[PDB]
Each structure stands twice: as C-alpha cells, then as structure tokens.
C-alpha cells in the first residue's frame with residue numbers, strides 16, 4: 001500500500017545515511033518519534049519539516065556545520081527538526097567508554113517510546129536506544145530489523 | 151502582516167547564509183522562484199520541501215556532500231529542492247573566468263523571472279542573475295536591498 005511503500009522508502013533512506021556515516025565515523029543522533037509525543041524536544045531544534053532523504057540526513061550531520069550538534073527528530077515520516085536537545089541519561093549501566101551522544105539517546109529512550117539511532121564518531125559503530133537500553137555494534141541487517149519491528 | 155514578517159525572516163535567513171558562505175569561499179547556487187513556475191527544474195533535484203533556515207542553507211552547500219552540486223530552488227518560505235539542474239546560458243556577457251554555477255544562474259534567469267544568487271568558490275564574490283543579466287561583486291547591503299525589492 002502507499003503507506004507501506006512510504007515506510008520502506010524511509011527505512012531505506014535512513015539505513016543508507018547511517019551506512020555512509022558509519023564508514024566515515026561521522027557522529028550522528030537520529031530519534032524517531034513514536035506514540036509518546038516529543039514536541040517539547042522538537043521545539044529546541046532548528047525547524048525543518050522536511051522530506052526524508054539519505055542525502056539530507058548526511059548533509060545535516062557533516063562535522064563542524066550548523067546542524068550537526070544535537071539530534072535529528074523524525075515525526076510522521078518527515079524530519080521535524082535538527083540540532084535538538086535530548087536529555088542525558090544518568091544510567092550507571094551504559095558502557096563507560098561512550099559519551100554524551102549515546103547518553104542523550106538512552107536518556108530520551110527512558111522517558112519516551114522512541115527509537116534512537118547513534119553513530120559513534122570514535123568507531124563508526126551503530127547503536128540503537130530504546131526503553132532505556134542501548135543495543136551496540138549493530139550490523140546493517142540488525143538495524144533494518146529494528147526499524148521494521150518498530 | 152504575517153506574510154510580510156515571514157518574507158523578512160526568509161530574507162534574513164538567506165542573507166546570513168550567503169554572507170557565511172562568501173566568507174568561507176563556499177560555492178553556492180540559490181534560485182528564488184517568482185511568478186514563473188519552476189516545477190520542471192525543482193523535479194530534477196532531491197525534494198526537501200523544508201522550512202528555510204540559514205543553517206540548512208549552509209549545510210546544503212558544504213563541499214563534497216550529497217546536496218552541494220546543483221541549485222537550491224526556493225518557493226516562497228521553503229527550500230523546495232536541492233541539487234537541481236538549471237539550463238546553462240550561452241550569453242557572451244558572462245565573464246569568461248566564471249564557471250558553471252554562474253552560467254546556470256544566468257540560464258534560468260533567461261527563461262523565468264526568478265532571482266538567483268551565486269557565491270563563487272574561487273573568490274567568495276556574490277552575484278545575482280535576473281532577466282538574463284549577471285550583477286557581480288555585490289556588497290551585503292546591495293544583496294539585501296535586491297531581495298527586499300524582489
């Protein structure tokens with residue numbers, strides 16, 4: 001159906017952008033709003049309300065640019081805003097070598113049902129935060145399964 | 151009115167982005183649609199349909215990124231698409247040292263009433279193409295006045 005084709009197109013756009021950033025070890029933080037509304041965090045960023053594309057996602061996260069500092073938040077199949085604030089987790093159970101990008105992803109996942117994708121700037125490793133937990137060292141197959149499950 | 155305030159915000163966003171890119175010698179090609187519809191050219195690019203911001207305009211044009219090659223086309227207060235094709239002018243009044251961005255800008259200006267801004271990656275100079283003419287080496291003040299008058 002139209003809705004299904006649109007969801008698959010967005011999943012493909014995300015995975016392509018994530019693959020590009022993982023290869024180049026470009027740090028990234030991408031939160032997908034679900035049932036819990038995140039308007040209050042969207043409002044902290046730069047409004048975009050833009051169509052999703054792998055190209056736009058990549059251009060947002062390029063290091064040392066206006067938009068790369070903070071989270072992209074997606075809502076209703078669009079990029080709602082970039083450079084958004086997310087709350088930092090105080091969980092003592094996050095791997096100690098990880099920094100604020102991952103703690104922000106876990107933090108928003110503690111108070112929403114959202115799914116957040118993180119690319120490490122140190123390793124290019126890809127992880128997902130959901131329900132207060134961080135799922136690390138994901139393959140492409142694993143991230144896709146997570147997006148389809150979501 | 152709200153229409154006039156939105157226009158002023160878009161002009162402020164455009165001028166801030168152009169000023170930033172000029173200082174850094176970031177090549178840019180930005181066409182503002184007017185009364186002649188540019189749908190045929192918009193459809194050649196990557197759709198964004200995004201709210202304008204100086205930050206997004208800058209991020210689009212960062213060298214060696216997916217979106218930087220080709221024109222950004224704006225429709226009113228939105229970035230409609232990036233990496234768009236524009237036709238190349240054959241006018242003999244284009245300085246011979248100028249490259250394809252300037253020739254594309256004059257080209258679209260010959261078949262539309264649009265206003266196109268170009269930042270040279272060679273010199274950082276700012277120019278505008280309108281009605282088949284290229285006006286070069288604009289001050290910040292002159293550009294803003296041209297946009298306000300448009």
Ligand SMILES: CC(C)NC(=O)Nc1ccccc1
Nearest residue numbers: 019022124126138139140143
């Ligand atoms: C060089 C690596 C880091 N290449 C990848 O493509 N990794 C990756 C990990 C999770 C999801 C998608 C891609």
Ligand SMILES: [Mg+2]
Nearest residue numbers: 285286287288
């Ligand atoms: Mg002059």
